[PDB]
Design a protein around this ligand. Structure first.
Ligand SMILES: OC[C@H]1O[C@@H](O[C@H]2[C@H](O[C@H]3[C@H](O[C@H]4[C@H](O[C@H]5[C@H](O[C@H]6[C@H](O[C@H]7[C@H](O[C@H]8[C@H](O[C@H]9[C@H](O[C@H]%10[C@H](O[C@H]%11[C@H](O[C@H]%12[C@H](O[C@H]%13[C@H](O[C@H]%14[C@H](O[C@H]%15[C@H](O[C@H]%16[C@H](O[C@H]%17[C@H](O[C@H]%18[C@H](O[C@H]%19[C@H](O[C@H]%20[C@H](O[C@H]%21[C@H](O[C@@H]%22[C@@H](O)[C@H](O)[C@@H](CO)O[C@H]%22O)O[C@H](CO)[C@@H](O)[C@@H]%21O)O[C@H](CO)[C@@H](O)[C@@H]%20O)O[C@H](CO)[C@@H](O)[C@@H]%19O)O[C@H](CO)[C@@H](O)[C@@H]%18O)O[C@H](CO)[C@@H](O)[C@@H]%17O)O[C@H](CO)[C@@H](O)[C@@H]%16O)O[C@H](CO)[C@@H](O)[C@@H]%15O)O[C@H](CO)[C@@H](O)[C@@H]%14O)O[C@H](CO)[C@@H](O)[C@@H]%13O)O[C@H](CO)[C@@H](O)[C@@H]%12O)O[C@H](CO)[C@@H](O)[C@@H]%11O)O[C@H](CO)[C@@H](O)[C@@H]%10O)O[C@H](CO)[C@@H](O)[C@@H]9O)O[C@H](CO)[C@@H](O)[C@@H]8O)O[C@H](CO)[C@@H](O)[C@@H]7O)O[C@H](CO)[C@@H](O)[C@@H]6O)O[C@H](CO)[C@@H](O)[C@@H]5O)O[C@H](CO)[C@@H](O)[C@@H]4O)O[C@H](CO)[C@@H](O)[C@@H]3O)O[C@H](CO)[C@@H](O)[C@@H]2O)[C@H](O)[C@@H](O)[C@@H]1O
Ligand SMILES: OC[C@H]1O[C@@H](O[C@H]2[C@H](O[C@H]3[C@H](O[C@H]4[C@H](O[C@H]5[C@H](O[C@H]6[C@H](O[C@H]7[C@H](O[C@H]8[C@H](O[C@H]9[C@H](O[C@H]%10[C@H](O[C@@H]%11[C@@H](O)[C@H](O)[C@@H](CO)O[C@H]%11O)O[C@H](CO)[C@@H](O)[C@@H]%10O)O[C@H](CO)[C@@H](O)[C@@H]9O)O[C@H](CO)[C@@H](O)[C@@H]8O)O[C@H](CO)[C@@H](O)[C@@H]7O)O[C@H](CO)[C@@H](O)[C@@H]6O)O[C@H](CO)[C@@H](O)[C@@H]5O)O[C@H](CO)[C@@H](O)[C@@H]4O)O[C@H](CO)[C@@H](O)[C@@H]3O)O[C@H](CO)[C@@H](O)[C@@H]2O)[C@H](O)[C@@H](O)[C@@H]1O
Ligand SMILES: OC[C@H]1O[C@@H](O[C@H]2[C@H](O[C@H]3[C@H](O[C@H]4[C@H](O[C@H]5[C@H](O[C@H]6[C@H](O[C@H]7[C@H](O[C@H]8[C@H](O[C@H]9[C@H](O[C@@H]%10[C@@H](O)[C@H](O)[C@@H](CO)O[C@H]%10O)O[C@H](CO)[C@@H](O)[C@@H]9O)O[C@H](CO)[C@@H](O)[C@@H]8O)O[C@H](CO)[C@@H](O)[C@@H]7O)O[C@H](CO)[C@@H](O)[C@@H]6O)O[C@H](CO)[C@@H](O)[C@@H]5O)O[C@H](CO)[C@@H](O)[C@@H]4O)O[C@H](CO)[C@@H](O)[C@@H]3O)O[C@H](CO)[C@@H](O)[C@@H]2O)[C@H](O)[C@@H](O)[C@@H]1O
Lengths: 504, 490
C-alpha cells in the first residue's frame, strides 16, 4: 500500500499566471547555469549503476489516493547533472517534493547510506495509470525533452519544450525544464495537468501541459516565453527523431535491416489548405530547409510505414513507434516549418529535428504566447482526404535496356486512397502527374495505375543542371478535372558529385 | 480459319533412333558452321509477327498449335522445322504468307507453343542457340534452360551449342502432350533430344538426350539452368535501382544423393565465381524464385515475383560428379549472369554415346522440397554491436526459417533450438537462434570475422537443430568479403 511522499517547505498559492510571472522575472536577469557538481558518489556513476536505480511503486505520487493516475521520478546522475525540482499541486497550492532515499531501490548504485540532501531534486518524471503501474504513458527527462506513446506502447521520437539555433552550423542552445508542478487530478478526471518552468541562456518560459492518455495520447499545451536576448532561430513545437536508412534514402544501407528510422516523413497542413508529405533522408552533410507558411494548421513527423515486414526488428519494433502531430491553437501568423537533417552512421543519434520558426525575431522583454496540441499514436488526427503517398523509391535513371548517355536519377512515388481505386479500374481515366523542380529537368514522366495497391504510381527521371551538389526540390501531385487527387509530395535531393556520377 | 502450311520435299520416315543416327554421324565428321549471312533494333525486330492463320495444327482438332520466330537480330543460325505425321517428318518451308512484316529453305529462329484456347499466350518457346523457356500457370517468362552447356565459367571462351532442327510431332486430338525432337550440333558435340512437353499449372518436360562428342570435352554441363540475379537481400552490392529485388531466381536448390536439402542464395559477385557441389546420384537440382511477394519487387511490367522455378530431376542415377554454379558480375538485368548444371565426373570422349534423361518442372514451386523448415529470407550487413566502437571488421547475417515443426517450437517456452554453423575460414561470434513470432519460425543471427585483409570466398553452412536432428534444410552461403579499402570506410 502506497505512502504519502516526503515534502519540502509549505504549500504556496500556484497558478499559470503565477508561473508566467516567475519566468518573466527570471528573464530579467542574465542566465546562470543550473548544472551542478552532484554529491560525491552521485557525480560519477556508470551506466550499470545508474540503470539499477528504481523508483518504488509504494512511493508513487497519488498512489495513496483514489484517482486514475500516478507519477514516479527519475534519479539524477549519469547524464543528468541539472536538478529538476518537482512539486505537487493540491487545492491550488504547490508543495515541493523532497528527495527521499526511501522512495528508491538503489540496486548496485552504492547510494544507500550516502547523505544526499532533501533538496537534491530529480531528473524528471513519468506518468502511469493506477490500473497499469508499470506502463509509462509519458516521460519527461533530460533538458526540455519528453516522450509519450499511444496504444501500442512502443517509445520512439521525442518532443521538446523548445529548440534554439538547431542546425545553424554554429552551437545549438538546449533549454532545460528546471521545475515541474504536477496537479493532482480529480478522482474521476481523465487528464493530468503538468506545469513546467523552462530556462535557457536566451529565454525563459512557463508551460502548461494537459495530458489526456488514450489510444492516441493528446497533450494540450500552452507556452509563454520571455526572451533575454534576440534569437536567430527559435523553434516552437519541436519534434526530434532519427532516420538512418530506408526506401526514401539508401545512402547508409549498411544494415541487414532495410528500414531503420523512428519516423519516415515530415507532414504539413498549410494555412492555404495544402497537405504535404516530405520524405525524411539521411544526407551526407547537414541540411536545413524551411517551408514558408502563415497560420499553419499542423505539422509533424510521422511513421507512416507500419508494416513489420519492411523493418524486421523484433527487438525495438520500429513499425510501432508513434507519430507526433503538432496542431497550433489559433493563428500563428507568418513563419516557416523548418527541418534539420544531420548525417548519421547509426540509429543511436536523433538526426531529425522539425519545428515552427515565427517570422519575427523575439526581442528582450517581450512576451510570446504559443499554444498547440500534440498527438502521439499510430495515426495523426488529421490527414489529407485525398490519396496519401504510401511509398517513395529512388535509383539510377535511364531507360532499362538502353545505353545510358547522361546521368539522371529515377523516382517512383506510390499513392493510394481517396478516389484512386475507382480511377485505377477505369481504362479511360486520365491522371496527370504535376511536377515542379527547383532546378534541372525531368524526363520519362508517367502516372499510371498500380493495381496491386489499387492506387497510382508516378515515375520521373531528374537530370541535375550541373556537376554540383546543390539540393534540388521536387513538388509532385496527381490531378484530374480541376482537382488534385493526392496530397503533395515534396522531396529534397542532394545530387551526387561528378566523381560518383562517373562510376554510374 | 487457319490454312495448311507450305511444305518442302516429301515426308520421310522418322523416329528417335533415326535422329540419334543423324547426330552420331554429324559428330564423326568435321564440324561445319551453321551461321549464315541472311539474304533491326530490338524494338524494330517485332514488326515481324507470325500469323495465326498460318499456325501449325490450327486447322486440326487438337488442343495445341505452334508458331515460329523469324531469323534476325540475335538470330543468324537457321533452324529447320519439321512436322511429324504418321511416323513421317516433312520440312516446313519458309513462307512470307505466314508473316506480317527470301528462299523456301531460309529456315526459322525457333518456335513457340500455344493451346488452341489462348493463341496469344505461349507456354513454351525454343529460341536462340540451344535455349528454351516455359512457364506454368502465372504465364510470366523468366529463367531459361539449355540443351547443353560447354566450358561455362572456365576463364576461357564458352562454346554454345545450337539446336539446328526441331521435329514437332502432331499430337493425337485428345493428347495433353506435345513431343518435340531436337538435333543439336556444336564444335565439341552433336546430340539427339526428345522433349515430351505437358502443359499444366506446373509444366513438365520429360527429356531424353543422346550425346556424341566430336572431341574431348573439358566441362560438360547437363540440364543447364540459366538465370539472372542483379540485386536483392541476398546481396545488395549492386543496389543502383529503385527496385529492391531484381532477379529471375534467388537460390540454387539441391537434393543430394545422400538425401540432404541445400539452399544456396544467389549473389551478384564483383568477379566471376565458379563453385562446385560434389554429389553422387543427385536426386534433383534447380534455380528457384522462392520470394513470390510482389511487394518486395514492385515491377508491375515484368513481374519478377511470378517468374518460374526450374527443377531438374534425373530419370536415373547419374553417378559421381558435381552440381556447378557460375555467377558473373552484372550491372543490369538483361544479362544472364547465373548458370547451374550437372557435370559428370567422367570426361566425354570422341566416339562415345552418352544417354542422359531428366524431367524439367516449370512453375511457382518445385515439385519436391525439404519436408523440414525452409530458408525464407537471407539478410546481411555490417557486423558489430550497434552503436559501439568496433575493434575489428565483421559481417552480420540474419537467416529466417519457416515450416516443419518450427511453429510449434516457437510457441513452446521449453523448446531448445540451436544454430549449427560452420565456416571454411575466419571465425563466428554473437550467434543466436530465436523465435521469430511474426513468421511463426526462427531466426538465426551471427557475425563472421574474415581471417585476413583479402577477398577469398568464405563458405558458410548453417542449419537449426534440436535433440541432435536438423529442423531445417541446409543454408549454404558463399561470401566474397569486401577489400580492405571498403572495410576502412566501415
Ligand atoms: O526482354 C529483355 C531484352 O530487353 C531489351 O531492352 C528493351 C527494353 O525492355 C525492357 C523493358 O522495357 C519495356 C518498356 O518499358 C517502358 C515503360 O513501360 C511501362 C508500361 O507503360 C507502357 C504501357 O504498357 C502497357 C502494356 O502495353 C504494352 C503491351 O504489353 C502487352 C504484352 O506484350 C509484351 C510481351 O508479352 C509477352 C511476353 O512473353 C514473351 C517473352 O518475353 C519475355 C522477354 O524475354 C525476352 C528475353 O529477355 C530475357 C533475357 O534473357 C534471354 C537472353 O537474352 C540475353 C542474351 O542471352 C544470350 C546468351 O548470353 C549468354 C552469355 O554469352 C554471351 C557472352 O557472355 C560472356 C559469358 O559467357 C562469360 O562467362 C562472361 C565472363 O565474365 O563474359 C560474358 O561476356 O558474351 C558474348 C559477348 O561477346 C555474347 O555474345 C554471348 O551471348 O553467357 C552467359 C554465361 O554462360 C549465359 O548465361 C548467357 O545466357 O548467349 C546465347 C548464345 O549465344 C544467346 O543465344 C542468348 O541470346 O544475351 C544478351 C547479351 O548479354 C542479353 O542482352 C539478352 O538479354 O536470350 C536467351 C536466348 O534466347 C533467352 O532464353 C533469355 O530469356 O534477359 C533477362 C535475364 O538477363 C530475362 O529476365 C529476360 O526475360 O530476351 C530475348 C532476347 O532479347 C527475347 O527474345 C525475349 O523475348 O523478357 C521480358 C522482360 O524480362 C519478359 O517480361 C517477357 O516475358 O519472350 C518469349 C521468347 O523467349 C516469347 O515467346 C513470349 O511470348 O511476356 C508475357 C509474360 O510472359 C507473355 O504472356 C507475352 O507473350 O513481351 C514483350 C517482350 O518483353 C514486350 O515488349 C511486350 O510489351 O503482352 C501482354 C500479354 O499478351 C499484353 O496483355 C500486354 O498488353 O505490348 C505492346 C506491344 O509490344 C506495347 O506496345 C504496349 O506498350 O499493357 C499492359 C497490360 O495491359 C499495361 O499494364 C501496360 O501499362 O503501354 C503504353 C502504350 O499503350 C506505353 O506508352 C507505356 O510506356 O506500364 C507498365 C505497367 O504499369 C510499366 O511497368 C512499364 O514500365 O514505360 C516507360 C515510359 O513511362 C518507358 O520508358 C519504358 O521503356 O515497355 C515496352 C512496352 O511499352 C516493352 O516492350 C519493354 O519491354 O523493361 C524491363 C524492366 O521492367 C526490362 O527488363 C527490359 O529490358 O524496352 C525498351 C523500350 O521498348 C527497348 O528499347 C529495349 O530494347 C534489352 O536491350 C535486351 O538486351 C534484352 O534482351
Ligand atoms: O536412353 C534411355 C532412353 O532410351 C529410349 O530408347 C531408345 C533406345 O535407347 C536404348 C539404347 O539403345 C541403343 C542401342 O541398343 C539397342 C539395340 O539397337 C540396335 C539397333 O536396333 C534399334 C533400331 O536401329 C535402327 C538403326 O537406327 C540406329 C541408327 O542407325 C543409323 C546408321 O548407323 C547404323 C548403326 O546404328 C548400326 O549399329 C550399324 C550396324 O552395322 O549400322 C549402321 O548403319 O547410320 C545411318 C547413316 O549414318 C543413319 O541414318 C542411321 O540412323 O544409329 C543410331 C546411333 O548409333 C542408333 O542408336 C540407332 O539404333 O537404323 C538402322 C538402319 O541403318 C535400322 O535398320 C535399325 O532398325 O531402331 C529401332 C527403332 O527404329 C530400335 O527399336 C532398335 O533397338 O539396330 C542396330 C543395327 O541397325 C544395332 O547395331 C543396335 O545395337 O537394339 C536392341 C534390340 O532391340 C536393344 O535391346 C538395345 O537397347 O544400340 C544403339 C547402337 O549402338 C545405340 O545407339 C542406342 O543408344 O540401349 C540402351 C541399352 O544399353 C537402353 O538403355 C536405351 O533405352 O535406343 C533406340 C535406338 O536408338 C531408340 O530407338 C529408343 O528410342 C527410350 O525411349 C527412353 O524412354 C529412355 O529413357
Ligand atoms: O495564451 C493563450 C492561452 O491563454 C490562457 O489564458 C491565460 C491568459 O493568457 C491570455 C493573455 O493574458 C495576458 C494578460 O492580459 C489579460 C489580463 O491580465 C491582467 C492580469 O489579470 C490576470 C491575473 O494577473 C495576476 C498577476 O499575474 C500576472 C503576473 O504578475 C506578476 C506576479 O506573478 C509576480 O509575482 C509579481 C512580482 O514579480 O509581478 C507581477 O507582475 O505576471 C504574469 C507575467 O507578466 C502575468 O501573465 C500574470 O497575469 O499577478 C498579480 C499579483 O502580482 C495578481 O493580482 C493578478 O491577479 O491573473 C489571473 C489568474 O490568477 C488572470 O485570470 C488575469 O487575467 O492582472 C494584471 C495586474 O495584476 C494586469 O496588468 C493584466 O493586464 O487580464 C484580462 C482579464 O481582466 C485579460 O482579458 C487579458 O487577456 O496580461 C498579462 C500581463 O501583460 C500577460 O502576461 C498575459 O499573457 O492575454 C491574451 C490577450 O492578449 C490572451 O489571448 C491570453 O489568453 O493569461 C492569464 C494571465 O497570465 C492566465 O492566467 C491565463 O491562463 C488560456 O487559459 C488558454 O486556454 C489559452 O490557450
Amino acid at each position: 500500500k502506497a505512502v504519502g511522499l516526503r515534502r519540502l517547505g509549505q504549500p504556496q498559492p500556484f497558478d499559470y499566471a503565477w508561473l508566467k510571472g516567475q519566468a518573466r522575472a527570471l528573464a530579467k536577469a542574465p542566465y546562470k547555469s543550473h548544472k551542478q557538481v552532484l554529491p560525491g558518489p552521485l557525480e560519477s556513476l556508470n551506466w550499470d549503476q545508474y540503470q539499477s536505480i528504481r523508483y518504488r511503486q509504494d512511493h508513487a505520487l497519488w498512489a495513496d489516493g483514489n484517482g486514475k493516475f500516478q507519477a514516479k521520478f527519475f534519479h539524477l546522475g549519469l547524464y543528468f547533472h541539472t536538478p529538476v525540482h518537482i512539486y505537487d499541486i493540491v487545492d491550488g497550492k504547490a508543495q515541493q517534493l523532497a528527495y527521499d532515499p526511501a522512495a528508491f531501490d538503489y540496486g548496485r548504485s552504492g547510494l544507500g547510506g550516502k547523505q544526499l540532501p532533501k533538496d537534491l531534486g530529480f531528473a524528471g518524471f513519468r506518468l502511469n495509470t493506477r490500473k497499469d503501474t508499470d506502463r509509462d504513458f509519458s516521460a519527461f527527462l533530460g533538458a526540455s525533452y519528453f516522450r509519450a506513446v499511444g496504444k501500442e506502447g512502443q517509445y520512439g521520437q521525442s518532443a521538446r519544450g523548445l529548440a534554439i539555433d538547431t542546425g545553424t552550423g554554429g552551437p545549438e542552445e538546449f533549454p532545460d525544464f528546471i521545475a515541474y508542478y504536477l496537479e493532482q487530478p480529480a478522482d474521476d478526471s481523465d487528464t493530468v495537468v503538468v506545469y513546467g518552468l523552462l530556462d535557457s541562456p536566451s529565454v525563459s518560459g512557463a508551460y502548461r501541459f494537459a495530458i489526456t492518455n488514450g489510444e492516441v495520447l493528446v497533450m494540450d499545451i500552452d507556452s509563454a516565453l520571455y526572451p533575454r536576448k534576440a534569437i536567430e532561430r527559435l523553434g516552437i513545437g519541436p519534434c526530434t527523431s532519427m532516420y538512418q536508412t530506408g526506401e526514401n534514402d539508401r545512402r547508409m544501407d549498411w544494415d541487414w535491416r532495410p528500414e531503420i528510422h523512428d519516423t519516415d516523413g515530415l507532414a504539413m497542413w498549410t494555412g492555404g489548405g495544402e497537405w504535404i508529405w516530405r520524405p525524411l533522408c539521411n544526407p551526407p552533410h547537414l541540411r536545413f530547409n524551411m517551408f514558408v507558411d502563415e497560420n499553419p494548421r499542423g505539422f509533424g513527423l510521422l511513421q507512416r510505414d507500419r508494416n513489420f515486414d519492411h523493418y524486421q526488428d523484433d527487438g525495438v519494433f520500429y513499425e510501432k513507434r508513434p507519430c507526433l502531430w503538432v496542431e497550433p491553437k489559433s493563428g500563428w501568423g507568418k513563419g516557416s516549418v523548418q527541418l534539420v537533417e544531420i548525417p548519421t552512421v547509426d540509429e543511436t543519434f536523433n538526426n531529425i529535428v522539425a519545428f515552427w520558426n515565427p517570422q519575427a525575431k523575439p526581442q528582450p522583454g517581450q512576451e510570446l504566447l504559443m499554444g498547440y496540441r500534440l498527438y502521439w499514436g499510430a495515426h495523426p488526427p488529421a490527414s489529407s482526404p485525398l490519396a496519401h503517398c504510401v511509398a517513395t523509391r529512388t535509383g539510377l535513371g535511364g531507360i532499362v535496356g538502353q545505353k545510358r548517355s547522361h546521368f539522371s536519377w529515377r523516382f517512383a512515388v506510390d499513392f493510394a486512397g481517396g478516389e484512386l481505386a475507382a480511377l485505377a479500374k477505369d481504362p479511360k481515366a486520365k491522371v496527370e502527374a504535376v511536377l515542379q523542380v527547383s532546378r534541372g529537368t525531368t524526363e520519362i514522366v508517367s502516372a499510371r495505375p498500380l493495381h496491386e495497391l489499387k492506387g497510382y504510381r508516378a515515375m520521373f527521371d531528374l537530370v541535375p543542371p550541373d556537376e554540383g551538389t546543390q539540393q534540388i526540390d521536387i513538388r509532385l501531385f496527381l490531378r484530374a478535372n480541376g482537382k488534385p487527387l493526392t496530397e503533395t509530395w515534396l522531396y529534397q535531393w542532394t545530387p551526387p558529385p561528378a566523381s560518383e556520377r562517373k562510376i554510374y
